[PDB]
Amino acid sequence: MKKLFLVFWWHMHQPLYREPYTGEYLLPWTFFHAVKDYYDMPAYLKDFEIKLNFNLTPVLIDQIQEYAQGKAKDVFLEAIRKDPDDLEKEEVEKLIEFTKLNYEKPIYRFERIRELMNKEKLNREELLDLQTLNLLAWCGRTLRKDLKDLLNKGRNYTQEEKEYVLNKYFEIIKKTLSIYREIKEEGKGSVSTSPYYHPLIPILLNPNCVYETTPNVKIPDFAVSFREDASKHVELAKEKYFEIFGEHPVYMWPPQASVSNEALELYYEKGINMLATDEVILKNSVERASPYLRYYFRELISVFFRDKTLSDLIGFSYHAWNAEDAVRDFIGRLKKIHESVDFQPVVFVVLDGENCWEYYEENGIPFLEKLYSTLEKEEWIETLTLEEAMRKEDVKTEVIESVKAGTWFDGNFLKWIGNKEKNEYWKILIEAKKKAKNDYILVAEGSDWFWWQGEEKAPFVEVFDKLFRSFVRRAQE
Numbered sequence: 001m002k003k004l005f006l007v008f009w010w011h012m013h014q015p016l017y018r019e020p021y022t023g024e025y026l027l028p029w030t031f032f033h034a035v036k037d038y039y040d041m042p043a044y045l046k047d048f049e050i051k052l053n054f055n056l057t058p059v060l061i062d063q064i065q066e067y068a069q070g071k072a073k074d075v076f077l078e079a080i081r082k083d084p085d086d087l088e089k090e091e092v093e094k095l096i097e098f099t100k101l102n103y104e105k106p107i108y109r110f111e112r113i114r115e116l117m118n119k120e121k122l123n124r125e126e127l128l129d130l131q132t133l134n135l136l137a138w139c140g141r142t143l144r145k146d147l148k149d150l151l152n153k154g155r156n157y158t159q160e161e162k163e164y165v166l167n168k169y170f171e172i173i174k175k176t177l178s179i180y181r182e183i184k185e186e187g188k189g190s191v192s193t194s195p196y197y198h199p200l201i202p203i204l205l206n207p208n209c210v211y212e213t214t215p216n217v218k219i220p221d222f223a224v225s226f227r228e229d230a231s232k233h234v235e236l237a238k239e240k241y242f243e244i245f246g247e248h249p250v251y252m253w254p255p256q257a258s259v260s261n262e263a264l265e266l267y268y269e270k271g272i273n274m275l276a277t278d279e280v281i282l283k284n285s286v287e288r289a290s291p292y293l294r295y296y297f298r299e300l301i302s303v304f305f306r307d308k309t310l311s312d313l314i315g316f317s318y319h320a321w322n323a324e325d326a327v328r329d330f331i332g333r334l335k336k337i338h339e340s341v342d343f344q345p346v347v348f349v350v351l352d353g354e355n356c357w358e359y360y361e362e363n364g365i366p367f368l369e370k371l372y373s374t375l376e377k378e379e380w381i382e383t384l385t386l387e388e389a390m391r392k393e394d395v396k397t398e399v400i401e402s403v404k405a406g407t408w409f410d411g412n413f414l415k416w417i418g419n420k421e422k423n424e425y426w427k428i429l430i431e432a433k434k435k436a437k438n439d440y441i442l443v444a445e446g447s448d449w450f451w452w453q454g455e456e457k458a459p460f461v462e463v464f465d466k467l468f469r470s471f472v473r474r475a476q477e
């Protein structure tokens with residue numbers, strides 16, 4: 001039987017939201033995505049006989065452990081936790097703006113939220129509901145079955161009921177990293193990591209990588225070298241992986257799929273057997289390649305290229321469709337790949353594993369449950385782990401010699417460098433690295449800080465600029 005080999009690689013990352021001096025988490029994005037996706041995505045493998053693979057960044061690992069140890073001083077979560085009678089006006093405005101940002105996401109479709117937002121003034125019992133419903137909107141698949149009745153109530157929540165939800169939420173956080181260990185040991189999937197603080201390795205190694213796809217951009221004069229710090233990102237991530245899993249990582253996802261001939265060399269010298277990047281880089285780098293093949297880079301390392309179409313469909317398109325339609329579309333495009341090639345194709349599906357689900361109905365649980373059940377019965381599709389895909393001899397392999405540096409965002413680095421605003425953050429980093437006396441410089445080399453800068457008016461970009469400038473300052477002391 002000619003088979004199609006499907007590889008799912010779910011990338012999970014949250015930049016360090018913890019302000020260095022105050023030790024306060026200024027955004028609750030780690031807590032809400034952990035209680036909703038970080039435990040629940042692998043928990044699918046307990047109920048579906050398929051293979052899924054996950055990528056965890058070290059900085060995400062650090063935050064979840066702090067939240068699981070009760071040490072994270074989340075300011076927003078404290079506004080949820082407290083009785084509304086102890087709530088200052090600023091915290092109440094913070095709660096209402098958080099609800100306004102998510103008001104139109106399907107996971108916030110609670111009738112009570114319609115009322116309370118249309119309400120001009122709010123009493124304590126209404127504020128308790130704005131807190132509790134805000135927590136309950138971010139409920140993952142596991143606890144959605146457990147707290148079904150609280151979720152069915154929809155209103156008239158109490159302080160004790162909200163605190164019960166919160167303890168149940170923290171139990172999931174305490175169980176999160178064990179499930180990644182469990183699915184790795186059980187063979188139900190492979191776990192990978194990225195360089196520690198999600199940096200852009202091609203830029204740190206040689207900033208001239210931006211001109212390979214964007215020749216007339218203006219980048220800041222890099223008067224300092226970041227090549228040593230680039231190795232530290234890879235090297236420290238292997239130790240965090242060894243801490244959690246007891247072995248060194250052999251598979252790594254380059255942050256934002258960023259690859260260069262130099263990064264690939266570095267990943268080879270630090271022991272990475274395989275990495276993955278986007279189809280755009282393949283089309284820029286090699287003449288008429290297919291993304292359905294294992295690739296050897298100069299015999300040193302193995303590179304797989306993701307399917308941009310299928311991955312973006314889940315990441316951006318399928319949320320609008322009914323669940324049955326999206327799954328049928330997905331299998332339809334897989335059936336066309338099967339007939340497009342005269343070999344047994346490998347189809348790599350890589351995307352962020354947490355951010356798309358909030359825009360889906362019921363946090364995407366129906367779509368995922370129909371996709372995993374469909375994939376269970378379709379026998380021309382075999383889901384694989386990254387390790388199984390590495391050892392499989394039914395996957396055609398070709399050797400390539402070069403790549404053109406880029407990312408999965410248009411094949412260029414323009415989302416992080418190129419304009420005056422983005423270049424401001426690099427000039428700050430370069431000048432600070434000249435004076436950097438601690439490793440908080442590595443936090444400031446994270447990709448997220450540069451992403452939010454100057455693109456458009458966006459949510460809580462203030463908070464990102466505060467942390468960047470805080471990490472930079474603490475890096476020079």
Ligand SMILES: OC[C@H]1O[C@H](O[C@H]2[C@H](O)[C@@H](O)[C@@H](O[C@H]3[C@H](O)[C@@H](O)[C@@H](O[C@H]4[C@H](O)[C@@H](O)[C@@H](O[C@H]5[C@H](O)[C@@H](O)[C@@H](O)O[C@@H]5CO)O[C@@H]4CO)O[C@@H]3CO)O[C@@H]2CO)[C@H](O)[C@@H](O)[C@@H]1O
Pocket residue numbers: 011012013014015029033101256352354355447448451458459460
């Ligand atoms: O810009 C218009 C555009 O986006 C709109 O969505 C906005 C959301 O409605 C809003 O919530 C806003 O706020 C958050 C986001 O919700 C939250 O998740 C926050 O946290 C993380 C991600 O969770 C995390 O995964 C990480 O993501 C990385 C990703 O892992 C990596 O693979 C790569 O893709 O880069 C991502 C960023 O580096 O980091 C972010 C933070 O860095 O992110 C936001 C900041 O608070 O998010 C959207 C901003 O507008 C609407 O969808 C629509 O108007 C448009 O499509």
